C-alpha cells in the first residue's frame, strides 16, 4: 500500500493499475509480472519480487 499526493489513491495495491483482483500473486500484475508462473510457485514481477527483498512478502527471485 502506498499514497503520496492524492485524495483517492485506491490503486495502491500498486498505486497504479490494479483492482487487487487482477493483480499479481501478491501485488498488482494485471498483465504477466508476479502473476502466473516463473518463481515463488507463481510468477516474478520485480515489485512483488522486491516485496520479497526488503519486505520478504513473497519468495521468488525478483524480475
Given candidates 27, 40, 58, 60, which one binds Zn ion under the rule CB under 5 A?
A: 27
Q: Which is nearer to Zn ion, 7 or 58 (CB)?
A: 58
The 3-class SS string of the chain reads CCCCCCCCCCCCCCCCCCCCCCCCCCCCCCCCCCCCCCECCECCCHHHHHHCCCCCCCCCCCC
Q: Which is nearer to Zn ion, 10 or 31 (CB)?
A: 31
Query: Is 44 among the residues that bind Zn ion (CB under 5 A)?
Result: no
Binding site for Zn ion (CB under 5 A): 24, 27, 33-34, 45, 47-48
Amino acid at each position: 500500500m502506498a499514497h503520496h499526493h492524492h485524495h483517492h489513491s485506491s490503486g495502491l495495491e500498486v498505486l497504479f493499475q490494479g483492482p487487487e483482483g487482477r493483480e499479481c500473486v501478491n501485488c498488482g500484475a494485471t498483465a504477466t509480472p508476479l502473476w502466473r508462473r516463473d518463481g515463488t510457485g507463481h510468477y516474478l514481477c520485480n515489485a512483488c519480487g522486491l516485496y520479497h527483498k526488503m519486505n520478504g512478502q513473497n519468495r521468488p527471485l525478483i524480475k
